[PDB]
Amino acid sequence: TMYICGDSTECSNLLLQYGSFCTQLNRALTGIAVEQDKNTQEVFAQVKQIYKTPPIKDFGGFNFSQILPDPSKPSKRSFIEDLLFNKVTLQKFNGLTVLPPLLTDEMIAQYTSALLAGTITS
């Protein structure tokens, strides 16, 4: 209703005769909205017991410094994925709203540490 006949009474009345189109759209956009959380749920949470690396780094001459999380940053991100977050380039008047994801961007980086800490010692 807001997009088609924003802030007008008469326009909102003639749209009524067209039946259930307005209901049909809102379910369609909701169907993909819920689905998106299911995807990032599926690919990242394959481990449920969140491991953490030991402080020692005597890994037989290897160093995993670029991939092990750096505590210095305000978010627990490592060297590599700081480059990626800088490379990418990215509320509105007419009803267009953006909804936040369920998993906050800091939450995902915590999973990948467990997936990485587990595979380097176990």
Ligand X SMILES: *[C@@H]1O[C@H](CO)[C@@H](O[C@@H]2O[C@H](CO)[C@@H](O)[C@H](O)[C@H]2NC(C)=O)[C@H](O)[C@H]1NC(C)=O
Q: Which residues bind ligand X (CB under 6 A)?
A: 63, 65
Partner from another protein, ligand X, none binding residue 51, C-beta < 5-8 Å depending on class: none
Which pair of structure tokens corresponds to residue 17?
């005769």
Among residues 30 and 65, whose Cβ is nearest to ligand X? 65
CB nearer to another protein: pick between 15 and 120: 15
- When the beta carbons of 38 and 92 are compared against ligand X, the nearer one is 92
Tokens standing for residue 100: 């936040």
Q: How far apart are CA 65 and CA 69, in angstroms?
A: 8
CA distance 32 to 58: 46
Cα gap 1→94, rounded to integer Å: 10
For residue 93, how many other CB atoms are within 10 A of its CB?
A: 7
Of 54, 74, 93, 121, the residue at the interface with another protein (CB under 8 A) is 93
Give the orientation angle of helix 105-119 with respect to helix 21-44, to 10 degrees: 30
Point out which span in 51-59, 65-73, 74-82, 100-108 binds another protein (CB under 8 A): 100-108
**Residues of this chain that bind another protein (CB under 8 A):** 2-5, 7, 10-11, 14-15, 18-19, 21, 24-26, 28-30, 32, 35, 37, 39, 42-44, 46, 91-93, 95, 97, 99-104, 107, 115
